[PDB]
Structure formats: C-alpha cells, structure tokens
Amino acid sequence: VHPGIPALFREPPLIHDLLSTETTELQSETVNKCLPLLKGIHNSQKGPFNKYGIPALQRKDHLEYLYDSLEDYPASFVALDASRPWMVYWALAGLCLLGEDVTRFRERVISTFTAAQNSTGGIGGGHGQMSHVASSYAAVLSIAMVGGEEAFKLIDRKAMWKWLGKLKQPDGGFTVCEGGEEDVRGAYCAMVVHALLDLPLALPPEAEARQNGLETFTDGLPEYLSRCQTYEGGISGSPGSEAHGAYAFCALACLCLLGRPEVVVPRYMNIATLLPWLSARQYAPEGGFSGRTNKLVDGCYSHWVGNCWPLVQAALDGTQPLARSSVGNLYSREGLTRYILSCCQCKLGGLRDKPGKHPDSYHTCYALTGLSTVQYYHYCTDSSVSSKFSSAFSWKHDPNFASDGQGSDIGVFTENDRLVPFHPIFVIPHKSAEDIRVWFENQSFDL
Template sequence: MASRFVLIENIRDSRPGKMSEAVEEEVLLPRHIKYAKRIMGVLPTETQGLDTSRMTILFFGVSGLDVLDGLSEVSCQDKADMVDWIYAQQILPNKSHSNLYQCGFRGGSFIGAPYQPTSSQNEVNISYNTSHIAMTYTALASLLVLGDDLSRVNREGVLAGVRHLQQKDGSFCSTAEGTENDMRFVYCACCVCYMLNDWKGMDVVKAAEFIKTSQSYDHGIAQGPLLESHGGSTFCAIASLSLMGRLDSTFSPAELERLKKWCIRRQQTGFNGRPNKPVDTCYSFWVGASLKLLGIGSLVDSAWNRRYILSTQCSITGGFSKWPECHPDPLHTYLGLCGLSLNGEKGVCPIHAALNISQRAADWLKTLHTNT
C-alpha cells in the first residue's frame, strides 16, 4: 500500500501550479442536457461518416441524458419512437434460420431495409444485411435506459449472432464478414450475454483465456496478445471479467496488483491511455471505471480529475472534447459525464461501471432478470 501513496505523491509534486490557485468551475448541466438532446436529433455534415453507427450515437445521447437525470425532458411519444427505431434495426431469423449468424442489431437504416419495428420475422433478403456487435450492445443498453423490457428482442437470434463472432482464440469479431477481432468486441459480447442473462452467446473459458494472454509485459492489457497495453482495452478486459464473475479467478493476486499499478500510473493531470501520451477526457472513464472495478477507485485524485474534465467542457454548446480548446463530440461528452459520475460529481447520476450505463438502468435490468 505504501508504494502506491508514494507514487501519488510523486505525481502531485510533478504537476504545475497548486490546487488552491485553481478557479472552481461548475459543470454546466443544462447545457449538457441540450447537447445530449441535440445529438439524438441531428449531427453536423462532417459527421456523416458515422451514419453506419447511428445506434451508438443514439446511445451516447439517450444514456448521457439519463446520467444527467434529464430523461424527463423527452416526451413519452419520443421515447416510444426511439424504442421502435431501435427494434426496426434488429435482424431477425428467417423461416429456415439460415441467417442466424447475421442476427443482432444494425447501426441504422443505411442498408435499405423496410421500417418494421414490430415484425417477428425478417423475410427481407438484402445483401450485407448483418449485425454489428457494438450496435447490438448499444441497442440493448439504450432499450434498458428507455425503460423497455427487452420483450421484442429475439434472444435466439442475438445469441446465435454473437456466438458466431467468437474466434478460436476466444476473441470476437464485430460482424460476420471481414472484420478485425479484439478486446473491444469481447467486451460487447459480454455485455450482450449479461444483459440477456444467458451466456450461450460465448465460450466464457476461452474468452477469459484470451483476456489473460492479452496482459502485456508492462502489466496493462492490450487489444490482444503481444500488442501494446492501452486504457481502453484494459477497461474492456476488466469489465468483461467482472461481468463474467471471473476477475479474481483469471488473474492471480500478484497479477491484479501489477494491473492496479499500471492503471493508477495513468493519472497525470487527468488520465492518459498509455505511458507518455497526453491526458484525454475519455480515460477518466476507461481508467477510472477500471480502478473502480479493481476496488481502488478511492486512489483517484478526484480534484485533479475533475479539473481536467472541466477544462474540456464547451461552455457555448455544451458537451466535452478530448482536449481543451477542441470541438466537443458525442463520445467524449458521454465518457466525460461518466468520468464525472465516477468522481462523485453532484448532479450527475451514479453509473454501473462495467455496463457503462446508469445505475438506475442497471437496476431496471436486475428487476427484469428477477421477474423472468
């Protein structure tokens, strides 16, 4: 324990200025609520490349609003329309079940499928009509945030689609054809299985083994074996094991201790994702959540963490950027808010660190699991 405190002292000593000189900034909650509502409706032209990932943008908006306790500002009709739009992106099994490996959720309507939010069987045969595991995760998460009971989710199709994406080494691809496989998609697969309360979507032993072999020589965790450790992949790995209930059985106490040290060393003024890289708002979540799941969230210097996140807050439009003086974007806005939540910020709701949704939405999921 003593060495950790010495480490934090050293970081403090190396920082410019003193906390007493800092101007106490406030989190501009109403502006961020406006920003979250805006990205749910429209994005600037330069973001058109995100059209295939609209499900994720919706998640950042709707879950961001939830973390800001602002969902009451969305009408019941708009919430119902959003739930219908999400279900309209579900790829359902056909009669012969020959497309099970493609089932799950698309990122949007870009493929040209007809709008069918209530259909129970998708008979439309469209080329390249395949799910994406990150879209399936954010679709289910957004449905929970919106209070849906997941009753229209085709569990057989979703779980078969996820299972098809697991590779021999235990990792996951993102889609059925021609994509990379790494820790990001292992995390998405774990979230999907956890939310559906059914682990038939993966071989958990193989997935845990993939995570263990991805711990790098410096004790952080990489996107895969023999790659560079990174704050994002470290979160994905720790959260996956936490959702599986295998964190303590996968890593030895000594390995976990070294992993904790790698994570706490990411805190500079804010958090960075790798040694010698600049700090960035999103790592207040990626690394902050990792520390919380490892049971040492209290070692975060919350004053410095808050100060950095607020330096990336846009006082004109709302939202957060990765660095000060940059344009805000949906991802850094959502993860900045989650970082503030982990920091205990007043007015920002508590989150479930492993699922990356509000604790309220996670409690709703627990109710669903209890009642089914």
C-alpha cells in the same frame, strides 16, 4: 490566483529532460493550453468557482447540447452512419447522468432500432448494415435506459444468441461481427449483451466454436483476456498489442462478469504490474488520464481508465457483506475533477477531449461518466438482484460527499455538480441494468 488551487495544478512537472522530440512538443503544448484553465483565469470559463477554484458543471448548457445531438445532421456527417446506435447511447447516457427522465424517448428509441435489427440476429449501425457487437451493446444499453416492456420486446433474443454464437473464436475471444476484427472490445460488448438479455450460457448446438471443444460463451474467455496483458502491466486490444486504457476497462469489466472481482482478477491478471500502470495513466498538472504511455490526457479516459479503479479496488478489497476495510481510491479524484470541470467544458455546451478540441457527444458522455465515478463509492456485495453473472448484479453504491479542506483523497466538485451513479460494468444506471436483467430472467427463452 484562486488560493484553493494547489501548486501541483499550476506548474509543469519539476523534472524536465533536455532532449526534445515530437512527444515532448505535444505534451508541452497540451500543458500550456491546460494551465490557464486549471488556474481558472481563462476568459472562456463561466462561474461560479468553488472554494477549490473550480468552475461549476454547466448542467443547462450540457443538457441542451445533448438534446440537440439527438436531432438531424447534415449530409457532411455521413461518417457517423455506422455509429448511429452509439449516438443514441452517448446522448441518453449523458442525459441520465445529468438527472433527466429519458423514458419519454421510449417510442423514438424503438423506432430507431427496429429497422437496425437483422432478422438473422443482432443489431447493426442501421438498415442494411450487418450486425455488430458495438451497435448491439449501444442498442441494448439504450433500451435499458428508456425501459418499458415494448422496448424490451423489440429484441429477438434467440436470434441474438445464435448470431453471438457465430462470433465465438477458438482462442476464446469474440469477433465484433462476421468477418470482422477480434479484440477485447468485442468480448466485453458481447458479454454485456449476453448478461443483460439473460442469454443461455451454452453455445448454440451448431456453433462453429464447438468443433474446437468450446461449449459455452465463457469457455476460454478469461484465458484469452490473460493473454492480452502486456509487459507494461496494462491490457491491449489483442495479444501482443500496446497496453491501452480503453482495452483495460473492457478486459477488467469482462472478467467481473465472470465471477467475483477478488477471485477472477488476481487469477488471470498480474495485479503487481497492472496497478502501477493504471496509476501512471494520470498526469499533473493536467489531472486527467492518458490512454497509453507517453501519449496525451483525454477526457473520455475519465471513464475508460477512471472506471477501471472501482473494479481493481474491488479485487483488492473483496466483496462487502451487508451484515470491512478498504484500500480506498488509488488515484487522484481531485486531479480528475479539475481536469473535467476546468479544462473539458465548452462554453457553448458539451464536453471535449482536451482544450483546443471541439466538443462531441462521445466526449460529453464519457467525461460525465468519469465525473460521476469520483462522486461515489462503488463496491460489490453478497446480495444480487439476479436469481442465479451473480456478482455483476451485486454492485451497490454510496455517495462520496464533497470535501472541505486539503487532503490526498478529496471531492473537489460541489454537491450542485452531483450526477446519477452508473454501474461500473454496464455503464448505465444500476436500476436500469437491474430492471432489464430481471425482466429477461422471468421470460422463457423462445422456441
């Protein structure tokens, strides 16, 4: 019965409908699994519990889990074949968050992605797989984290530029690969790769999209993203689909690559509907975020929904001069932290979707990313590391220190639980994003 745990996290909601459906049955079961963990009374939980009744982040267990995830898998894991670049990214990201030096992985990263890069441009899931923006995104971010000139030199920039040009669609969006689906995930991944490698803004002279009047990679892009907003306020994967947290992150992050958040976001999104929908993603007593209306909380949305908040709050606050008042956090940092630390930690290491699920490196990566977000003030400024996506490289951070006592916006983690800050747009450390961008900016585009 830890006294530091508010009733909000120990009881089901006050209002309950009489009507039972599949939705309420799943929601009820989820709440019932979470409650003993939230209360800190489940036998699977390891201490120490802090003054807020929350178990410590099991750093050593998660480290060992992430290191193990980078080794060999049995034949039964064949379904991960096309996702091997993601596997590398998720593990490296998690290790970075937990404070590890991942530079020793440089040569192994180079060896992994050398065979996965196609001569015609881009990176696929592995040898003989066609280039895909998601694997290219994962590869580029992995390269950024390990750093070094040799890793940077691995990418054929000109071929990447030509290949990305082929994905640009007349409606302004991007397909994820040649002949593949067009969704906002595609646009976000493409533009992150474009920005971090400092690719030319102009489409290749022979790009098909030029027949439709488009001239640059960003032509028609924010308009496309605007057409992905729904009546709910959230953002869908493609026009007309259902609002979803993962796609909201992709669209918002992509917009913030196009200009200052306070300029681009209100222009292309209706913030009046976006804000309450984002707010409604968080449930009690669970404390975590769901991805869409009337579905369940999931620890990976600690990132997808969680990292929408610094972007939206920057759109409301505006750019900070290094030489002003803030709206603050518009969600519950306490709730999210309780969900991650009390409910999403597996006793054997790794983090999970929700109680009852096995851990995996994807959920480990994004739960930790979400945990890091609550521990920092993330904001954009008028000073950029870029010598010319200027706002995207102007993001800075200050620690939001662990709190004492009660309050609406408090840090209920301990300082022992503090993770490395991640860039809200690039989802890697700020210095990693800075270093790769600056290096490529100083390299002449190849002939």
